[PDB]
């Protein structure tokens, strides 16, 4: 199984530094060029830097040249991005990517990690409050029931939400965060059969990595 696992994303103050790592497994790492690509909050993809299979050739986008250093350790099967002089514009999800290894010129990026999130801001990390959304007390019982949880007042993005630790996967809608007085809020809904709740347990699992928060909120009838 080809895997590229990024780590190191965090909230950093302007002017600050940060080091990202990407652990490559399941292929011959030294046989491929590698790149970092980032996705900014406007959802645009932006190429950041590349490194040749042995590391003697590197190249950077105009935006990061002189501030970032890409490097690799083939024995460790690891790709690095050292960042410095961070600014608002560097806020993005950073993806580790593998280049195809065809001859006769340059190559497309054929495998991509899941990404690691970096935010550059003077604002402080704020953990979310998590509130259960159970139907109103006068609510009508139908064959279907929709539950939810409201994740409020956190910074920076992201939070992740799962239901019953992933078991409840279909019938889930998790909405994009919205800014509210400079903190983020989102909500997630899950729809399940009325026979299954409150008979069997339904729990929303909320993680906010930047504050090391993990909350499991049980949805209980009012």
């Amino acid at each position: 199984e080809v895997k590229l696992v990024e780590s190191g994303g965090d909230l950093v103050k302007p002017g600050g530094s940060l080091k990202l790592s990407c652990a490559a497994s399941g292929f011959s790492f030294s046989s491929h060029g590698m790149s970092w690509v980032r996705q900014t909050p406007d959802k645009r993809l932006e190429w950041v830097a590349l490194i040749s299979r042995g590391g003697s050739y590197t190249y950077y986008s105009d935006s990061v040249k002189g501030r970032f250093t890409i490097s690799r350790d083939n024995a460790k099967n690891t790709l690095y991005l050292q960042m410095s002089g961070l600014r608002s514009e560097d806020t993005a999800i950073y993806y580790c990517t593998r280049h195809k290894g065809l001859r006769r010129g340059t190559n497309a990026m054929d495998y991509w990690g899941q990404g690691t999130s970096v935010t550059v801001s003077a604002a402080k990390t704020t953990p979310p409050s998590v509130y259960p959304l159970a139907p109103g007390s006068a609510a009508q019982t139908n064959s279907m029931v929709t539950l939810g949880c409201l994740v409020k007042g956190y910074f920076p993005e992201p939070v992740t939400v799962t239901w019953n630790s992933g078991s409840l996967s279909s019938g889930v809608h998790t909405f994009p965060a919205v800014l509210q007085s400079d903190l983020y809020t989102l909500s997630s809904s899950v729809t399940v059969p009325s026979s299954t709740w409150p008979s069997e347990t339904v729990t929303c699992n909320v993680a906010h990595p930047a504050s090391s928060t993990k909350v499991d909120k049980k949805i209980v009838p009012r």
């Binding site: 105009d62 497309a108 409050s129 939810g148």
Partner: protein, 217 residues
């Protein structure tokens, strides 16, 4: 650097029809008998996925309904036939010169039949109330088209202050949208009114779809 321009910015297409997406470069990206333009698909919550490399080569594992063509400064990605899980943003990217650069992307949307939303309303949780705040949450699930207008009423009067709306992207199976609409007000304000209504007006019906509760049951 090489500037890549994609058009159109978005394209809406019925299931089974052809979609053609254009990428133009500020200079030729040809060399050595090849053209170095590659195409990627990006779906929400997922990293980009390689579709086509070096202008026309289909990446292993990608379905044959995706094809690329073009040369020098002018390239096209074609999807034929378009299927429900093709909802995504598509990007071109050149590697003929460093620094490597991406196009701005083209968002593919699916045209389908109208569908009424399923609406659910939730009073502020007791837990939030003890914290001193009050959010009333409304979910409008599985509807089409995207631009439903949600309206809030409190004791029968339209209420706009404190309302924030958020949409998911189009569902990769049924091609519908979902959204949340959240009314946030002080606990004081929440407690001095009785009836709370969220209303969806949508031309899948002449009557609004309504969900309401009374804080006094």
């Amino acid at each position: 650097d090489i500037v890549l321009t994609q058009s159109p910015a978005s394209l809406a297409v019925s299931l089974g029809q052809r979609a053609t997406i254009s990428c133009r470069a500020s200079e030729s990206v040809d060399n050595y008998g090849n053209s170095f333009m590659h195409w990627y698909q990006q779906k929400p919550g997922q990293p980009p996925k390689l579709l086509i490399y070096r202008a026309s080569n289909l990446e292993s594992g990608i379905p044959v309904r995706f094809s690329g063509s073009g040369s020098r400064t002018d390239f096209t990605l074609t999807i034929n036939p378009v299927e429900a899980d093709d909802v995504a943003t598509y990007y071109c990217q050149q590697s003929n010169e460093d620094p490597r650069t991406f196009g701005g992307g083209t968002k593919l949307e699916i045209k389908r039949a109208d569908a009424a939303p399923t609406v659910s309303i939730f009073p502020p949780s007791s837990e939030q109330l003890t914290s001193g705040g009050a959010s009333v949450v409304c979910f409008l699930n599985n509807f089409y088209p995207k631009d439903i207008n949600v309206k809030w009423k409190i004791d029968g009067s339209e209420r706009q202050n404190g309302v924030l709306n958020s949409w998911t992207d189009q569902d990769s199976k049924d091609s519908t949208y979902s959204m949340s609409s959240t009314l946030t007000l002080t606990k004081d304000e929440y407690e001095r009114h009785n009836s709370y209504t969220c209303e969806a007006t949508h031309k899948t019906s002449t009557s609004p779809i309504v969900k309401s509760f009374n804080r006094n049951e």
